[PDB]
């Protein structure tokens, strides 16, 4: 899925 | 040096991952759903690099235009995107809540015999019919196979592509050369480096790499890349 950056 | 961000995969984590994640569009988008730009951005990107790509996509040998949409979720990629571009399409995907409600998302689509197998299976243990594909799209799902399975999918898929098809990957990247474990879904997201090593570990050339525009600033970077088996 989309995921927020680390 | 760390072990290989890799290492850490254990499919049943993931499939008991999403097992309890909601059967909607705001699960399988890890909350970036409906109410947010994504999906309309997501659509239209996919659209715009198949169309820009048409030149590369002519069947051959009498074929038609035959898709699969791999760790496919609930279908929304087929229902709001692939569909259009597809003669008929199969979906493979491993968690059952997720196949159950692919039968309603999909309704429309299995009326008109669009819809041909859905297979319940992780990728890892799927095998496409021989020279079937047009198409195989593979979207925000492959970092759920370590680096040699992932080789190991792509290489059956060229098989299973009809002459002159075309492997999409549709994915996240990290921002620099290291790959990034997910312990939440036991993933991993890769660089857009390790990305074009497995390719070509895979025997695949790419074609066309895209960067989908228009998502929220705090995403990593989501890459389209359109393959084809290297010439003999
Ligand atoms: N080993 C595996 N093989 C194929 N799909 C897998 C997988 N492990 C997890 N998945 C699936 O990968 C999906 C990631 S979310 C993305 C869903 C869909 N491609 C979309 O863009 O809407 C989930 O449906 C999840 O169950």
């Given at each position: 899925?989309?995921?927020?950056?680390? | 040096?760390?072990?290989?961000?890799?290492?850490?995969?254990?499919?049943?984590?993931?499939?008991?991952?999403?097992?309890?994640?909601?059967?909607?569009?705001?699960?399988?988008?890890?909350?970036y759903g409906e109410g947010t730009v994504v999906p309309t951005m997501d659509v239209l990107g996919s659209n715009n690099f198949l169309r820009k790509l048409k030149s590369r996509m002519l069947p051959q040998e009498n074929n038609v235009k035959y898709?699969?949409?791999?760790?496919?979720?609930?279908?929304?990629?087929?229902?709001?995107?692939?569909?259009?571009?597809?003669?008929?399409?199969?979906?493979?995907?491993?968690?059952?809540?997720?196949?159950?409600?692919?039968?309603?998302?999909?309704?429309?689509?299995?009326?008109?015999?669009?819809?041909?197998?859905?297979?319940?299976?992780?990728?890892?243990?799927?095998?496409?019919?021989?020279?079937?594909?047009?198409?195989?799209?593979?979207?925000?799902?492959?970092?759920?196979?370590?680096?040699?399975?992932?080789?190991?999918?792509?290489?059956?898929?060229?098989?299973?592509?009809?002459?002159?098809?075309?492997i999409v990957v549709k994915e996240n990247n990290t921002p620099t050369d290291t790959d990034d474990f997910d312990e939440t879904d036991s993933s991993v997201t890769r660089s857009d480096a390790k990305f074009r090593q497995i390719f070509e570990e895979?025997?695949?050339?790419?074609?066309?790499?895209?960067?989908?525009?228009?998502?929220?600033?705090?995403?990593?970077?989501?890459?389209?890349?359109?393959?084809?088996?290297?010439?003999?």
């Amino acid at each position: 899925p989309p995921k927020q950056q680390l | 040096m760390d072990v290989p961000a890799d290492s850490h995969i254990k499919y049943e984590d993931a499939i008991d991952y999403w097992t309890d994640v909601d059967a909607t569009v705001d699960g399988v988008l890890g909350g970036y759903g409906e109410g947010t730009v994504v999906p309309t951005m997501d659509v239209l990107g996919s659209n715009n690099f198949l169309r820009k790509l048409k030149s590369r996509m002519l069947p051959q040998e009498n074929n038609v235009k035959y898709a699969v949409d791999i760790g496919a979720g609930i279908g929304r990629v087929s229902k709001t995107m692939l569909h259009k571009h597809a003669a008929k399409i199969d979906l493979v995907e491993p968690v059952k809540p997720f196949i159950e409600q692919m039968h309603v998302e999909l309704a429309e689509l299995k009326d008109k015999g669009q819809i041909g197998q859905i297979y319940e299976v992780g990728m890892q243990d799927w095998t496409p019919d021989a020279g079937k594909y047009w198409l195989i799209w593979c979207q925000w799902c492959v970092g759920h196979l370590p680096d040699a399975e992932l080789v190991a999918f792509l290489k059956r898929c060229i098989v299973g592509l009809q002459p002159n098809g075309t492997i999409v990957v549709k994915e996240n990247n990290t921002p620099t050369d290291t790959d990034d474990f997910d312990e939440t879904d036991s993933s991993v997201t890769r660089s857009d480096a390790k990305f074009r090593q497995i390719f070509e570990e895979a025997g695949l050339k790419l074609i066309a790499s895209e960067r989908q525009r228009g998502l929220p600033r705090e995403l990593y970077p989501v890459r389209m890349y359109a393959l084809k088996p290297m010439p003999n």
